[PDB]
Amino acid sequence: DLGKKLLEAARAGQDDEVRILMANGAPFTTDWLGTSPLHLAAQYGHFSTTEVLLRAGVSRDARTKVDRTPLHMAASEGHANIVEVLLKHGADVNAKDMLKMTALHWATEHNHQEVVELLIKYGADVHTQSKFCKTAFDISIDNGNEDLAEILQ
């Protein structure tokens, strides 16, 4: 269907088809786990597609069934380019998922220093505690990454 074609197109990073489906009237849907086209575009690193979705009016802070937002995915995957546009369109830098973790937590867990710096610039709260009482700093320490630990203390 149209909604699915949109989900599939975003995942595929087919921005023109995305424009196409949204024109026809494709319903902004999500899969069995609450994954939306924006989560998919940001997760897979589809810049033009993400941008097209944003300029289409899709929910910036859409939540999956584990409470992840597209920013969470983007940060987790290290797509600074995607993280930047999402923030530039009003994405909450401090959104927390099911484990009470922020994009900062994930970009740190996955050692994405540039995304960590970018997040820190967009006012991200550096000292939020996860469901495990961990701030991003703790994650960097647990990961033995002293370079990140220094910017996160």
Partner: protein
């Protein structure tokens, strides 16, 4: 809120370890205290008479899916057959390590 989300919540709550906890690093978990977990579930769904009987039935409906399944032979043990690392960002193994680390910090403090 779906049963799987609630169980995953409990499984990541260091304070719940006594009623439900992971058993291994492959996704299997056990309802160490099935009736308590059921009571807790009922409180989330606002079902005053929820119990393990009814909760297990709801768990069985998951048998057709790609989320949870039973662990044959092990009393009160089930398994998250979905890929947790892609779902929440941590595997069952990673989650179990983290929840145990948290419980230790708690015991050390108290």
């Amino acid at each position: 809120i779906q049963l799987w989300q609630f169980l995953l919540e409990l499984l990541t709550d260091k304070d719940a370890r006594d009623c439900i906890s992971w058993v291994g690093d492959e996704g299997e978990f056990k309802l160490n205290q099935p009736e308590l977990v059921a009571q807790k579930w009922g409180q989330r769904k606002n079902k005053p008479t929820m119990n393990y009987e009814k909760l297990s039935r709801a768990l069985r409906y998951y048998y057709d899916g790609d989320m949870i399944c039973k662990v044959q032979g092990k009393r009160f043990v089930y398994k998250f057959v979905c890929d947790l690392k892609t779902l929440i960002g941590y595997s069952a193994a990673e989650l179990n390590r983290l929840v145990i680390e948290c419980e230790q910090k708690k015991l050390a403090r108290m």
